[PDB]
Amino acid sequence: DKKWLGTPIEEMRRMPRCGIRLPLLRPSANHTVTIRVDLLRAGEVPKPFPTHYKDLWDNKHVKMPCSEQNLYPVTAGSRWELIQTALLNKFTRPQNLKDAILKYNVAYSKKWDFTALIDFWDKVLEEAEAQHLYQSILPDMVKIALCLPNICTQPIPLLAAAMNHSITMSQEQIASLLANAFFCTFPRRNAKMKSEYSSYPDINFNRLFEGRSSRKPEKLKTLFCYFRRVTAAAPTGLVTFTRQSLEDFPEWERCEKPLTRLHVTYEGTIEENGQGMLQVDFANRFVGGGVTSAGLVQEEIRFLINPELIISRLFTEVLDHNECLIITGTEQYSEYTGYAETYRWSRSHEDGSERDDWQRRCTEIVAIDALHFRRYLDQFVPEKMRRELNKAYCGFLRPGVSSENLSAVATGNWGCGAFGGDARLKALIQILAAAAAERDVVYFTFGDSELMRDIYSMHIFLTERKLTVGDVYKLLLRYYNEECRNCSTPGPDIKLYPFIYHAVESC
Ligand SMILES: CC(C)(C)NS(=O)(=O)c1ccc2c(c1)C(=O)c1ccccc1C2=O
Description:
Oligomer: monomer
Bound molecules: ligand 7JB
Order of helices and strands: EEEEHHHHHEHHEEHEHHEEEEHEHEHHH
């Protein structure tokens, strides 16, 4: 029983080795660069551009906590002056941190529960660990949070619905903003009945502090490992956030492109074994899912080990069906064990990834949200199948870039879990989208040895028969018509892979 099947992993494409020498990094109408490109040097902390803080308090930019327009009725008082007074206090007990956060969040003093913060500090941490948190970590986090106007000098545009826009900022700038999110300083991001930011994920970390879930200390340890690292020694690299939407989608039934190569394995992970590859994040439409709340599956774990991903929540609007978010340069700060209810923070991780010409770690992650199916048979509906293909296609396609400069896609069981996705159908959908996007697939089954063989055998059968993307999509439509459309039973009589084998072998 082989641990992997198909094309050997060495024959696949990886970054930055398959990376077409980056053009000169520069701001444009579609690219926001928040640092001095001319002064960008390996191992040096980037210099913010502009030199002095410029504010934009409008419908198109992040509303900064340090904005002179961040005011509260007291007569208008400065909310930033208030944050400074509240946070520049000695913390010696968890109650001190809760009281400080709530001084500039009065309206939420009875709505925000801090049980997990109090229990982490008092009931989980040993005395010396609790001592290091309040004497060192927390004050260092306060100073970087309060440094926001000197660090994040340029207004950050919102990556709104249908925008094809990028933001390149420093990891230092991300650390100042994530320190602010921890202290819940972002204004207009808290109300349940909020309109302006209703289509945006939560950014402030208040939900990380609530309840008695045994996974809250693991999240907090994962997060404090990051905060300790970035306050102790300023990170030097950059990170790019790109919102992508495609105007024209393929006419799937008509696609003459052949299938690409497949490496399928029941061992390994996307982060370790998918180095230099386009790494899929099985995302929630509000990027990050329950990272700073309850969730702790594939997406939340990635956002906890690479905390720079979380900041996407500050500016990324809920993804529409034709959109994805591409994040390049996030660094891995933690190692972990388990998954979901068994997830535990292990130790600090020293990211060995090389950096590209823009000082970005050579780690490309794409957030693509699968559909949630109320009923199992819903996913076989042609509209639902086309949607999934178009989602993954937009996530894999790199407009302008040629086939030979495209790394393999590092993926697995996308949308299969609480979302009700069928692993075998989703594997074929990603295989077809990668084929149309002219990329090979590296598929991780995470201990599921039978699924590895099933995907492999089906990929090799269609490949050997020279079945195009169109031919395979036409078989999916026949499956729906024959087995799903007029089926009143919760499940079909025959499964998808046996239908395909029969349909082809009888043709
Ligand atoms: C989570 C991330 C993005 C940091 N890495 S990863 O490569 O995507 C991955 C590693 C391990 C597992 C899974 C995914 C997974 O989905 C899973 C599902 C059901 C049971 C166990 C696991 C599991 O251990």
